[PDB]
Subunit: 33 residues, 3 copies
Protein backbone atom coordinates (compact mmCIF):
# COMPACT_ATOMS: atom_id res chain seq x y z
CA UNK A 1 0.00 0.00 0.00
CA UNK A 2 2.56 2.60 1.05
CA UNK A 3 4.90 1.78 -1.83
CA UNK A 4 2.00 2.13 -4.26
CA UNK A 5 1.05 5.45 -2.67
CA UNK A 6 4.66 6.59 -3.05
CA UNK A 7 4.34 5.88 -6.76
CA UNK A 8 1.00 7.69 -7.04
CA UNK A 9 2.46 10.64 -5.14
CA UNK A 10 5.51 10.70 -7.42
CA UNK A 11 3.24 10.65 -10.47
CA UNK A 12 1.29 13.56 -9.00
CA UNK A 13 4.51 15.48 -8.34
CA UNK A 14 5.51 15.03 -11.99
CA UNK A 15 2.06 16.06 -13.21
CA UNK A 16 1.96 19.08 -10.91
CA UNK A 17 5.45 20.06 -12.03
CA UNK A 18 4.35 19.90 -15.65
CA UNK A 19 1.22 21.92 -14.85
CA UNK A 20 3.33 24.55 -13.08
CA UNK A 21 5.58 24.87 -16.13
CA UNK A 22 2.61 25.15 -18.46
CA UNK A 23 0.76 27.63 -16.25
CA UNK A 24 3.88 29.76 -15.76
CA UNK A 25 4.37 29.73 -19.53
CA UNK A 26 0.77 30.85 -20.02
CA UNK A 27 1.05 33.52 -17.32
CA UNK A 28 4.34 34.97 -18.56
CA UNK A 29 3.88 34.46 -22.30
CA UNK A 30 7.09 32.45 -22.55
CA UNK A 31 8.08 31.93 -26.19
CA UNK A 32 4.71 33.40 -27.10
CA UNK A 33 2.69 30.76 -25.25
CA UNK B 1 -3.67 7.00 8.23
CA UNK B 2 -2.93 5.18 4.98
CA UNK B 3 -6.61 4.95 4.03
CA UNK B 4 -6.99 8.68 4.65
CA UNK B 5 -3.89 9.35 2.54
CA UNK B 6 -5.38 7.20 -0.23
CA UNK B 7 -8.40 9.49 -0.17
CA UNK B 8 -6.28 12.65 -0.19
CA UNK B 9 -4.24 11.24 -3.06
CA UNK B 10 -7.39 10.36 -4.99
CA UNK B 11 -8.71 13.88 -4.45
CA UNK B 12 -5.42 15.26 -5.74
CA UNK B 13 -5.60 12.99 -8.79
CA UNK B 14 -9.08 14.33 -9.58
CA UNK B 15 -7.97 17.93 -9.06
CA UNK B 16 -4.84 17.45 -11.17
CA UNK B 17 -6.92 15.79 -13.89
CA UNK B 18 -9.28 18.77 -13.90
CA UNK B 19 -6.33 21.17 -14.01
CA UNK B 20 -4.82 19.26 -16.93
CA UNK B 21 -8.09 19.52 -18.85
CA UNK B 22 -8.38 23.23 -18.13
CA UNK B 23 -4.75 23.96 -18.96
CA UNK B 24 -4.92 21.92 -22.17
CA UNK B 25 -8.08 23.83 -23.10
CA UNK B 26 -6.29 27.12 -22.45
CA UNK B 27 -3.19 26.03 -24.36
CA UNK B 28 -5.07 24.73 -27.41
CA UNK B 29 -7.96 27.19 -27.46
CA UNK B 30 -10.52 24.39 -27.30
CA UNK B 31 -14.01 25.71 -28.01
CA UNK B 32 -12.51 29.18 -27.85
CA UNK B 33 -11.27 28.84 -24.27
CA UNK C 1 7.41 6.70 5.51
CA UNK C 2 3.77 7.61 6.11
CA UNK C 3 4.66 10.87 7.87
CA UNK C 4 6.91 11.81 4.96
CA UNK C 5 4.12 10.96 2.52
CA UNK C 6 1.76 13.15 4.55
CA UNK C 7 4.20 16.01 4.03
CA UNK C 8 4.54 15.32 0.30
CA UNK C 9 0.76 15.14 0.00
CA UNK C 10 0.37 18.41 1.89
CA UNK C 11 2.91 20.05 -0.41
CA UNK C 12 0.96 18.76 -3.40
CA UNK C 13 -2.28 20.11 -1.95
CA UNK C 14 -0.69 23.55 -1.60
CA UNK C 15 0.73 23.41 -5.12
CA UNK C 16 -2.56 22.22 -6.59
CA UNK C 17 -4.40 24.96 -4.69
CA UNK C 18 -2.04 27.55 -6.14
CA UNK C 19 -2.47 26.09 -9.62
CA UNK C 20 -6.25 26.20 -9.25
CA UNK C 21 -6.09 29.88 -8.28
CA UNK C 22 -3.81 30.69 -11.20
CA UNK C 23 -5.84 28.68 -13.70
CA UNK C 24 -9.12 30.19 -12.49
CA UNK C 25 -7.54 33.63 -12.80
CA UNK C 26 -6.46 32.82 -16.35
CA UNK C 27 -9.86 31.37 -17.24
CA UNK C 28 -11.89 34.25 -15.82
CA UNK C 29 -9.53 37.12 -16.57
CA UNK C 30 -9.41 38.15 -12.92
CA UNK C 31 -7.76 41.56 -12.53
CA UNK C 32 -6.85 41.31 -16.20
CA UNK C 33 -4.81 38.12 -15.81
Amino acid sequence: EVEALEKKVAALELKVQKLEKKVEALEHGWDGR
